[model samples]
Target: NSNICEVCNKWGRLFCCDTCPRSFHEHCHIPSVEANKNPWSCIFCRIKTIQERCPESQSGHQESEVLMRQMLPEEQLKCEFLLLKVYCDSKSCFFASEPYYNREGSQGPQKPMWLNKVKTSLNEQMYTRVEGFVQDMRLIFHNHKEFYREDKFTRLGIQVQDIFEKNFRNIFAIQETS
Candidate 1:
């Protein structure tokens, strides 16, 4: 016996993820929820799709939501609040929209000058450091390959342990994890 998406009636596995109660059609779901994919995605893709559609919100979209998927569940919960100071900065390397939107939506056009200055300061920090943040994270894993041989890091560190987990997962796995 086989289960398929009720909508598409195509062969699909039941796709579930941490934040989801309703399972999606593996192939039927938009973005194709492939369970085997590393740093698996769930219904969260809907949020991402929505964000893509509403580029306006992206101006201040929560940084956590954007980067959370690429990290493991434990990592997301553990260090999400801890932002890094960037070194080699550029427009493409940073999300310009997140802090900008955070300010405008929170301040609502009546914030004090110092508050505005703080917003600029935060955005500048993101620009100055996110790349190094990513690079340092990679080096930490790469240098300690045996650390991953231990149970603590094995599952998550089996491969290159890249920051681009979803991107790599898509290449190796046929189905998406939703």
Candidate 2:
């Protein structure tokens, strides 16, 4: 069989798989291994085998939530605080501002590029911890009846009373349904 590196694709010293019809560049496969190992497995084949055997190893929509819930209370709180901080800083972007569009009429907040920088500063693992909370908060804030109204006069400004009563209801409703 004419083998090519499955990772980089350029022809080079390849680590051929015993279980699957795939190969990897010796340098490209992580945790570099000796070519002489009997019944060699490519990185892809190893991952596939593990995922096939263990359903929890496979990433899915509900996995993050389960992981977050398993975190210690202090860690969970820390993640939530960081997420809330980011949301607070970017609250304006989430809110649509004035300047309704031209000939083709529309208005919406363009996501500021700075949000990516903030997200980048967060550890990917920690981000996963608060992702559900962040999502829930966004859903609560975004779908608030006051935020999306055409009339600025009717749009409710953020206030303590409004938050617990209206915004919490939105979040709680979603939680109950899901």
Candidate 3:
């Protein structure tokens, strides 16, 4: 029986995934999931729905597989998937909200970086190279560390940063040659 969030490992909330034994709480998913609109397919399963198209021959693993190339149509979904993973791990109350709210009294950092900007950039296809998209994502976490080092949000931001970097390497098959 599916009873726990893939992250929280608790049964406080439950919405079952269609293709698996796992139940999904809205909090356990991307913050924007419409639990009312539909119920099924958490993020990874949702991933293969489009991955069903690729897995081609020869050129599927072609030279263009290099992450430095301009973003291709096939690669765009990957950008989406990468962003979604971070969203799943993020606290929407803080990460998704405007910096203005926090800045009002806490005297927040002069510059802010959040997942929403990355999502918007991906949505508009502003990234020409996969590397450009990646650099932008890294900056968010870098800012988090710069803003706070030993705080609660900072610790979690590192966790989120770790999640993003590991998945990023695997998702786009980034090689650590340099």
Candidate 4:
């Protein structure tokens, strides 16, 4: 009355779904379970149940993408700058490929103390203080510009733009809305 197990295609002990007419060899019924369990569903029938639970919206999920596109250019630039500030400050905290120290006994390069002041705002989980941190970071960058290469900010700005787009999507949404 039933076809061969769809999985192993043999006549050994098999399990059949109560809802659908498909059968699987006991070993091949994905995550094989005891046959005594009544009202079991095959993989195909289980997929149907899953699809019913999480249906997509009619707009095909463009709402967030649309909002991102609508954000002001100035705000986007500000977000990218803030991300770059955090990245550079973090590097200064420990190490960079180009050593910042002069020699074994000499004092290190003068780090902008304000770097961590701003970074602490981020580090301490003060998400609400982002705007203030960003404003202070701009001044820190201005004061420390002479210590860095002329192109440093430009290069890091480009790098953090993509970083913001991918890793900070939720932050952008919150900041933009606020």
lDDT by residue (110-148, candidate 2, tens digit) is: 532232333333424444444444553344344443334
Clash pairs for candidate 2: none
- The lDDT of each candidate is 0.35, 0.43, 0.64, 0.45
List residue ranges in candidate 3 displaced over 4 A: 1-67, 90-93, 100-110, 175-178
Q: Which candidate tops lDDT?
A: 3
Considering every candidate listed, which one attains the maximal TM-score?
3
Cα lDDT tens digits, model 4, 15-44, are 778888877676444334455767776655
The digit string of per-residue lDDT tens for model 3 on 1-178 reads 4666664456775776777676556654543345464555666676666556554321223224555777887567677777776665635335654454243324455667676777777778898987777777777767776666566767766777788877776666554553
* Native-to-model Cα distance after best TM-score fit, residue 15 in candidate 2, in Å: 1.7
Q: Which regions in candidate 1 have their CA more than 4 angstroms from the true location?
A: 1-51, 54-130, 146-156, 160-164, 167-178
User: Clashing pairs in model 3?
Assistant: none
Q: Which 10 consecutive residues of model 3 have the lowest summed lDDT?
A: 55-64
